[PDB]
Amino acid sequence: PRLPAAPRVAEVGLNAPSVDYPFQWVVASYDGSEAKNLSDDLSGSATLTKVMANYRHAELTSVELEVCPLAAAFSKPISVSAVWTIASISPASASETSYYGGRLFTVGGPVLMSSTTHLPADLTRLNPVLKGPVKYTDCPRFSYSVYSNGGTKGTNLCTIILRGVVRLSGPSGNL
Amino acid sequence: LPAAPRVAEVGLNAPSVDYPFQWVVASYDGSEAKNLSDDLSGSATLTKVMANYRHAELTSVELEVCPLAAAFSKPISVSAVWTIASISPASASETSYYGGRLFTVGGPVLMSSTTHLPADLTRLNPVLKGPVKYTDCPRFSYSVYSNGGTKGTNLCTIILRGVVRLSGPSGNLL
Amino acid sequence: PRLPAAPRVAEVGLNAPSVDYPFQWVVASYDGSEAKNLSDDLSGSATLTKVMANYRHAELTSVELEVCPLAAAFSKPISVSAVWTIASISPASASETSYYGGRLFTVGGPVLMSSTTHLPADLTRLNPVLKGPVKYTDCPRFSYSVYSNGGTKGTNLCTIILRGVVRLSGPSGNL
Amino acid sequence: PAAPRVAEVGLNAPSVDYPFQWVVASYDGSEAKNLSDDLSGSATLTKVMANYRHAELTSVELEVCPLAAAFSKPISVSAVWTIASISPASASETSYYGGRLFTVGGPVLMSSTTHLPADLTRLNPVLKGPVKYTDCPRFSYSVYSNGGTKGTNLCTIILRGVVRLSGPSGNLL
Amino acid sequence: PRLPAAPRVAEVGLNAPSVDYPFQWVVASYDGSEAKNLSDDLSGSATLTKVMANYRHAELTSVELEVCPLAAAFSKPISVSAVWTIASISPASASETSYYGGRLFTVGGPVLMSSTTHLPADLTRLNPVLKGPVKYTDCPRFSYSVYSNGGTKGTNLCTIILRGVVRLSGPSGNL
Amino acid sequence: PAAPRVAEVGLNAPSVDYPFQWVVASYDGSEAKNLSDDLSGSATLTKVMANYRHAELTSVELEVCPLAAAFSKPISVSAVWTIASISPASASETSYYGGRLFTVGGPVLMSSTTHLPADLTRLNPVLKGPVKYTDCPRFSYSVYSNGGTKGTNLCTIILRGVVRLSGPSGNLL
């Protein structure tokens, strides 16, 4: 799904020295005990905020949400509906298939490893910049919902992890 | 489908914006067989989207029968067809019309693009709203066969997504 | 009678495979018992509708109304006034000579066969298309009236029959 | 061009401009009265357009002419020109773009601002044709409840404009 | 399987206006209650006969027999043996694997959708013409047999449907 | 150019002009009522702009339409279009440039001078964008205390204009 292009701000510079910072952290681990929703804006992510707390500029080069199955999900698949939107749009709970590009993955079964449940962000349409001189309103936001399937409260059927690369530029001299 | 003659539209350079849309039609469990045939020109969600524009023509539409986790151990069968708005298929008889498909979603293969049915806008009519009321507008008709559902499992879900080009906004109520 | 030209819709295509379908059916048989009127739009004619019920496009190439006399009309001619109009205009009963091109035929007498009582349709001015993507409002409509001349209720002085050719294109896959 | 339109070949036909004007209705303040009409099938205009195959609006406007009886009692009517597809409800004509609320009468019977002209660049000028267009002009107006005397008729609504008629048909004389 | 070429009649014309008529109808629905055989010649198929009842010429351009599985066949596959022969050859019941090109499909199991159970007709070797000036004896004939696997008389394990395209030419003026 | 603006690359995107009109509020003379709203986050316009990423005003105006009940009792409202940064206080709308004092009703309900159009050459036309602009149009009007009957609603404030919407987003259908 390719969203139509929209006018965007122009940023001069982009020639300052900068380092690509690869980050990855498990978003959460989910079972089938209850349906659980989580929507997060990458501008205000706590771990990502503390990654770029000392730099003036920080823009994403790639980011993707990974729905990794576990062994306990071999005989009990679990369903997760996920979407990447702009920060302005805030999807509701369990209603991420109503937004264009929202996909409903089902992890488990005989195929315990597959790249069909990793949802990437189309940074050409979203806003790569997370921290800058001005606060942007169309930064990527990931919203997902996990449907209950009678889990036993501890098996942790699936794990949602988020990884990517953020380019950090222009450190500010504060301590 | 064989070609048919069609009317012509003059101004294709009018300011138009491509409007991607997606909305879940309904979630079905195999407790009872359920039919649904809808013309895209009169579907409630699409028409509340495009009631504010004078012209609205599709670029690509595709109905999707996405399996859920509960359908892993209990597949469900749906027969679907994309036809002309003049033709209204009956219940459970979507295989009697040319191009009708009989999808069966579920099982260990929980994800596959083989159950995605796209509309043939080359032969159908992309235009849903315009100066005239066409009769070749696409109609999607599907029937879900009962297989012993639990009335709460929601084995499958029906997702209709695509792109509609809207042009000439109207001074409507909102 | 040649009506002045009026602007008409433009239809692209017309290159799809199509078959000329020759049709002919007796419209009715009339005697002099009572004056009888009949006006019919060729778009909604039942026999013609079932001819083109499986095709997307159906346009006339020629059509004419034939007032054929019978033997019983040899010594008792009968009068029929007929007109071809657009579907918007609906002639009244026995008032088809007030519309431009309406003609009053008298069939019978020593000349029992003549082509002067066959009224053709000027499809250059009317709309040849009967079935298409859009419903047209100026398709041919034939309106005629039969005047009573003291018939004996069963002799069937004249027979009105309609024949023509309709080109059918773009079959639709329905059964 | 705001929106695409259906192609019409052979538009260079002999056509005549036909100015028309007719009073829509006279309204008093006894009760609120709504009226919405599509110019495609207006009863008192089709008689003008019955003799021709093509009718295309060049200009059209809705006029709210006050009467002298409205001097001591103003009357308010809300009107809008819209697409024939859109059918505004009663007293909701100010919620659509171009919808006005003409109040007439009052101390001075001179305000010539009661004209409500149709924006044919955002509408479909064609009223009659081979097909039945769905975006022809439609006028919708609602008259609010004044303290009317049930007989005064202290407001007048009229329609005037120009329609270009082409391709006459062999109709009744 | 490609049958060797055989001499065939020559037909002049083939330039008359003609429309491709796409047809599709479910042949039947079968379960495992009992073994059921069906052999049908496409020249005399009732639905196909009424499709081309008003045309002088009608020749196939493509046709295939589809063995579509159902949900109830997920845990209970069903076996169908099918063959396309000439109208002269009439296969017996449950003996379609003895004829060259006869294939034994098994529909069901974890793979509920596959194009390996759709058997097409080699119209280069068979006779595309179904209706013409003369009656041909080598028109396509489809013969299939469904083996019983202890079905419960109502589950309808599989559905056999037949779809194709027939070109219709030279309508005859009859009503 | 009155003042510098933020650069916006890729402005040649497919855009559609979206005329909008909605009645702001109906006011009686019972008590003085102030209302100042920024078009960047107006509740009844964001629903139009929620489905698109960029929204740029082409024209906008504030209209004070009198009602018939104002014939015998005029009502005065002071309004101004200003920078969203500036937030004029109550009854101080005539102290800013372009602030008008529309009095409506009176002997004649015909004065069409109640239009207050925004000067977009001195403002920021953009209502929605990647950033949150601080100089978008903001309309501020205060209605003074008449001798109202607390139910008459003898004045109406409406907003109409055109917004160019570009870059639709995959929002709800």
Author numbering:
A (entry chain B), C (entry chain B), E (entry chain B): 21 to 195
B (entry chain C): 23 to 196
D (entry chain A), F (entry chain A): 24 to 196
Study text:
CSDaV is a positive-sense, single-stranded RNA virus that belongs to the genus Marafivirus in the family Tymoviridae and has a monopartite genome of about 6.8 Kb. In brief, CSDaV encodes for three quasi-equivalent CPs that share amino acid (aa) sequences at the C-terminus but differ from each other at the N-terminus. The whole capsid models of the two types of particles are almost indistinguishable and reveals a T = 3 icosahedral symmetry that gives particles with a diameter of about 30 nm. Each subunit of the asymmetric unit has typical Jelly Roll folds which consist of eight antiparallel beta sheets.
Besides the expression of free/non-fused heterologous proteins, we also demonstrated that the CSDaV infectious clone can be modified to incorporate heterologous protein into assembled virion capsids, just as it has been demonstrated for other plant virus-based vectors. This was demonstrated by fusing the GFP coding sequence to that for CPp21 in the full-length CSDaV infectious clone to generate the construct CS-GFPdupCS, referring to the fact that the GFP-coding sequence was inserted between two identical protease cleavage sites (CS) in frame with CPp21. When western blot analysis (using antibodies against both the GFP and CPp21 proteins) was performed on partially purified virions from the CS-GFPdupCS-infiltrated leaves, the free/cleaved GFP was not detected, but both fused GFP-CPp21 and free CPp21 proteins remained detectable, suggesting that the GFP-CPp21 fusion protein was incorporated into the CS-GFPdupCS-derived virions. Transmission electron microscopy (TEM) of the purified virions confirmed the production/assembly of ∼ 30 nm icosahedral virions that resemble WT-CSDaV virions. However, northern blot analysis indicated that CS-GFPdupCS virions likely encapsidate the recombinant sgRNA (∼ 1.5 Kb) but not the recombinant genomic RNA (∼ 7.5 Kb), while WT-CSDaV virions show encapsidation of both genomic (∼ 6.8 Kb) and subgenomic RNAs (∼ 0.8 Kb). However, in this experiment, only approximately 22.5% of the screened CS-GFPdupCS particles were gold-labelled, indicating that the GFP-CPp21 fusion protein may not be abundantly incorporated into all of the particles and/or the GFP is not always displayed on the outside of the particles’ surface. In attempts to reveal where (if in the inside or outside) GFP is displayed on the GFP-recombinant CSDaV virions (CS-GFPdupCS), we have determined the cryo-EM structures of both the WT- and the CS-GFPdupCS-derived virions. In total, 175,869 and 12,732 particles were used for structure reconstruction of WT and CS-GFPdupCS virions, respectively, yielding density maps at a resolution of 3.1 Å for WT and 3.4 Å for CS-GFPdupCS virus.
